[PDB]
């Protein structure tokens, strides 16, 4: 079978494994800090390098894939802390999208909201134009940041959050697993048909953004990942 | 939110957290051996000793769950390598069944295959009594061996299996994500209602079996869970 | 090594992690309500439910432990302020004992003050027949409320209190920090060689008792621990 | 009773409440990284600026304190994982000792080893020089990085380490509770007399060193401190 396999214990800049799009940044520490606390709209978003084969053309088979990493978001004065993280599947050619304005875009969408990716936010603001609950939460988006599907959760300043991702293809199911400051798992799966959403190769990556008043440090620091095609 | 969390990197005989069943007995290296490879029918079974509460019958809220734990299986002369392991959710008075004939039954079910109790199994052996494919595999079983589910694996003797398993109580699916020797992965996922399968209070654990011509070692070696209910 | 680690945020009265014993009662808002304000000689336990084996016979090893918990004690018309909060080590089968008069006796001792246990008491009331100092103190108990040795302390109605333990089983040292409403910390440490006074398996938990005309709130809000027995 | 108590969650490169020695820097996610991976014999030390009384030379009173701080240490291509942080209390003119060599020394002593100081070391290195033992350790030093005494320990690249310490001036005892990845906790206490070894008004703090070939990430994440002494 085809198998795709990777772990970042650790990020650097001047590594080709990685893409580096908008305001990117890799800290001294490994960490990768996508949004930049000094800019207006802030956007910023990282991914493999490498394009993942997740279907086939020729057979119809779909990837399984099971991937986990960690990031943390912290609050800083005098902004509210936003926007979000979203770790997200798209077209090998996917970009920042044109005149982005940051913000509950997560870096992903236009205005409107829509663009054309499949991925899990971590929504830390509440943009009522996107139909986001009340509170913060996590979500499954796919090709809009007006998720399919959303469950309570609360970004906690500071903490090192770790997410669990499982794609199993024959069910075509997206299950997410994550932590939490105090000890509990928050849970959420959808039903979700890359095939027909997404070609047959594929980018995966993380993205982040900031509004005027809306800023935080987003920071990505580790990420493994496996997906496996039964070819033929 | 009602938590219960745990993570065993290694396991002892004295540890009151852990429930014995059966055959079952701790290696100087810490790991489990589920089974006795010189008795008939053997069945060892280790049940996390603290009884979680899936679901609530004044709410109705189901809990969701993510554990990770790796295995080894490892064939012996002059036995059939089998039978396999099951990791298993049952109510918490659960025992070995009453005049176990082990071997395909796993340790959880009767002779028929029936039983109380859902689970995911690591198959290493054809019973046809049990409709079983004719390979290795990895099952999703719901009261019986005969699995609701199941998908092509390979159990390497000698080999270190990692497993991630994620319950989603709002869709009430059973991810689970086996990661190989050879470095592919494999997945499986089943809508499983718990709440209408198992009382609000169960257990967690591993089961392992073997027949009179049909033995191996069966280990455990680490255990990691995380199961959450929402309250008040 | 054998780790055991939990963290009640809040509590809940199906959790079958906790252990109640007498008068104890849950509160809506999650904390813990220990004494029944409106009984005589009221007792009320709380115990985590599973056994923690605190040393091994075979090793002779003994486990370390960091503990944090945060209680609140409130006064109430018309009854004396009493008689106050002992957190307790004591062997797996511990209940109130018989004919318990509650008051000085905080739960875990018989009328002269006797007991198995070990624990760090909160006293709110001077006792002169357990030796009580005159003023309200923190107190290190050996199998009896006539403390070991105490520290001026002081409770203030209503005041939420966060307490730090640490038990070095290499030095036997039990080392207690309380941060009180006005910031300060009180402290108190003592030897106690836990191995000696109590048996390899034992319950950690929280006490409170009252009188006829001595009564108050005594509320558990949170706790967190963890302990780790080195295994060789 | 006169009580020092602060909290950083996050620190700041222009808040006058810390003094900066060496190569010490904050990044942009508000962490301290004390030391420059691009540096020989590295050094950067964080010193909280108000000084702090810890005894009395009217009374002979000593305060106790309950301090709680996290930390980070991730190794990089292609130096050795070293030397390690300590937490230390010092006269309040302490600086990085002359000419160091850092390594070893950890920043707070000369070649010898030898410095004004008391405090808990995450040792990374084994100097035999310096006695350490074999492995990865936390250690109480006195004027020396010859610990007085040292418990094993181990260094997870990448991990975030809570540490709690609780000085008891009745006992005269230093309590150190460390909180490892695998989720075992480490611990180690000592007798340290602070008014026989160090000055009525200390600064507390932490340093890091690294030397040509021992380098990697030393980060201090927060830091919580209170202490009490006692006026009479
Ligand atoms: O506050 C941060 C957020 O900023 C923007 O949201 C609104 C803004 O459109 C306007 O309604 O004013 C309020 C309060 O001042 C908010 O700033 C972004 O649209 C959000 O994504 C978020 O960053
Ligand atoms: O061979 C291991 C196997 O033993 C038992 O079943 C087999 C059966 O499938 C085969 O046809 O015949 C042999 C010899 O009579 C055994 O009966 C167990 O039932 C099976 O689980 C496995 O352990
Ligand atoms: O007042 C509350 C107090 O009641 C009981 O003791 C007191 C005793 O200290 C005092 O001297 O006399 C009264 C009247 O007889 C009570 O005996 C409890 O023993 C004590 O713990 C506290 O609850
Ligand atoms: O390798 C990092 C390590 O370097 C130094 O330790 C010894 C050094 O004293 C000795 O002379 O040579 C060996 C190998 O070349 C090591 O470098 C530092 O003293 C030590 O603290 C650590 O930083
Ligand atoms: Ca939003
Ligand atoms: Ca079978
Ligand atoms: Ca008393
Ligand atoms: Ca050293
Ligand atoms: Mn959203
Ligand atoms: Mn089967
Ligand atoms: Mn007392
Ligand atoms: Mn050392």
Excluded at 110 to 138: C, I, L, M, Q, R
Excluded at 149 to 174: E, F, H, Q, R
């Amino acid at each position: 079978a085809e198998t795709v396999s990777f772990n970042f214990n650790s990020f650097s800049e001047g590594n080709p494994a990685i893409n580096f799009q908008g305001d990117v940044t890799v800290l001294s520490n490994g960490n990768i800090q996508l949004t930049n606390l000094n800019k207006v709209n802030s956007v910023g978003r990282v991914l493999y390098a490498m394009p993942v084969r997740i279907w086939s053309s020729a057979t119809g088979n779909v990837a399984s894939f099971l991937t986990s990493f960690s990031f943390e978001m912290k609050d800083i004065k005098d902004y509210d802390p936003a926007d979000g993280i979203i770790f997200f599947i798209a077209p090998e050619d996917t970009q920042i999208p044109a005149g982005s304005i940051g913000g509950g875009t997560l870096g992903v969408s236009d205005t409107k909201g829509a663009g054309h990716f499949v991925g899990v936010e971590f929504d830390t603001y509440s943009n009522s134009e996107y139909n986001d609950p009340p509170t913060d939460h996590v979500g499954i988006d796919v090709n809009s940041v007006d998720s399919v599907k959303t469950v309570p959760w609360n970004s906690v300043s500071g903490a090192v959050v770790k997410v669990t991702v499982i794609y199993d293809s024959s069910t075509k199911t997206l299950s997410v697993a994550v932590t939490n400051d105090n000890g509990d798992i928050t849970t959420i799966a959808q039903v979700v048909d890359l095939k027909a959403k997404l070609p047959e190769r594929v980018k995966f990556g993380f993205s982040a953004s900031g509004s005027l008043g809306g800023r935080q440090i987003h920071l990505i620091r580790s990420w493994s990942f496996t997906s496996t095609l039964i070819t033929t």
